[PDB]
Ligand binder design. Sequence first.
Ligand SMILES: [Zn+2]
Lengths: 392, 196
Amino acid sequence: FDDAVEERVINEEYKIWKKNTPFLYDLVMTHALEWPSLTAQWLPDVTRPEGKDFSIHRLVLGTHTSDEQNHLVIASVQLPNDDAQFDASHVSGKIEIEIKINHEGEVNRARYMPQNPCIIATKTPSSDVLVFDYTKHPSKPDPSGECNPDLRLRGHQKEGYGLSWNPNLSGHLLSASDDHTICLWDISAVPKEGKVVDAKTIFTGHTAVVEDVSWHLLHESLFGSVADDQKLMIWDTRSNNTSKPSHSVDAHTAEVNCLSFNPYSEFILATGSADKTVALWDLRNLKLKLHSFESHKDEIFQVQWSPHNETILASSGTDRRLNVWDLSKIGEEQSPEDAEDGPPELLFIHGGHTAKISDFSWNPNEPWVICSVSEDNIMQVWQMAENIYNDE
Amino acid sequence: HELFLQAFEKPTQIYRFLRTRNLIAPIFLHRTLTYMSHRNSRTNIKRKTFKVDDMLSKVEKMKGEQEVKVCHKKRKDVSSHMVKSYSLKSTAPIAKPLATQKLRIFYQFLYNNNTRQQTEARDDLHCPWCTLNCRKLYSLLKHLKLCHSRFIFNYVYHPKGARIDVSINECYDGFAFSRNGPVKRTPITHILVCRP
Ligand SMILES: [Zn+2]
């Protein structure tokens, strides 16, 4: 019953956080989604209306229900412009659902195709991976519940979470599953009519549940995978052996849950593990772990590089906190008082969530804006106080 | 008369309880707060010079210079193995190669409007509830005012002198709740911060 105490202790600390938000953020928007989301992905488009005090940003959210109909969600976020101020505690329209498409099961992950962001792949609790074109379905859903996935993709025996669209190769989509396999679908050529598509290739390397999968950002033939193997694998599509990857790295001391490649480096990537640390890897030499980001107090499930900064990285886990790391800060001299707070590499802690953070996304248009969604149904659109990373 | 603990003590403990708890897992770094700015001894200039590709070369040099049926799935909670609830040198270990004159402030405690018990902590601007060294007097007041809202802090200057009048706040009480699996909520936005 220490869990019942843990509840008040959480809320006393949520109050303290709230009270200080003005001194830690340039922006905090907090929204209770009708049903909680297991995914968050900032869409790349921005509507900048003529002479308005804001911009329109869109998000690829989803649902998770307790015996209710599930949806593929696209909501819209109104973000203020630099000159403009505006403050609310909603009655106004700031965050709202644009489209709610019928989905058959809770949305594990939802990721848009970089090439055509109208196309969204989804990881479903059922074996199959679905692809929807939000333009191909109405903005107001069908009350029948009748979910018509534009394309169905079979090859997995179980559900999973890892999902990656190849940037440099249109239609190439990768899935990670509890079935130890990675499936590769090519929808580009082979679009046809036939709603069901069987995987082009299946990667049977990992010895436990495959947690994540992501393509490399410059090589179209390279991708990485992490499993409960406590390992990270570097795969080359070009190779004929679908059981052996190019490299199998002993990444962590526990279950690795996520990987993210640096958008500025063709070598750097990071991995998030159950071992409560983020590991830094260089593709050039995988025999050496570059560094272990220490601060998380529980399992890490999402590790993501900031699009706007080469040295900025963020991580979210089961400690209800999201940490922001600056590599440029690694091994900097700290005062005993400075040291007291955290490693120099630790730039920021986001204490706005009262529950485990499921996903988070860096806004691709507004530097330092992050969307972090938790199981308590809360969605935050935050941005840390500029003085934290900026110098006059 | 020591009846003052009937108003105080309880909050003093809630804050002492949280001191041990918050040291373990923070809600924020004190150094990140705008009023705690000075805690951070370091700067941001090392970033426009920093190139992540140059990191391996350094690590290599370092190493070289060494001679209701609710199933709790690990990712979600769907409504042995998979906890069931019913209520009706290896790369593996941690690697960190690139790392390796005194003022007196009086605290006047007020209880049932009047009656003041005055404790002085000449220990500079250290927080009486969470031990933290606020270092600067402006910071201490903000710290107290925001991190200890169960109390009402009022600064009074005097050439003798300086004092913080501590009373018990009378208006205290997206939160946490007892949830089994997924829960339906009523959608509502809130803008907590918005700086131009
Ligand atoms: Zn304190």
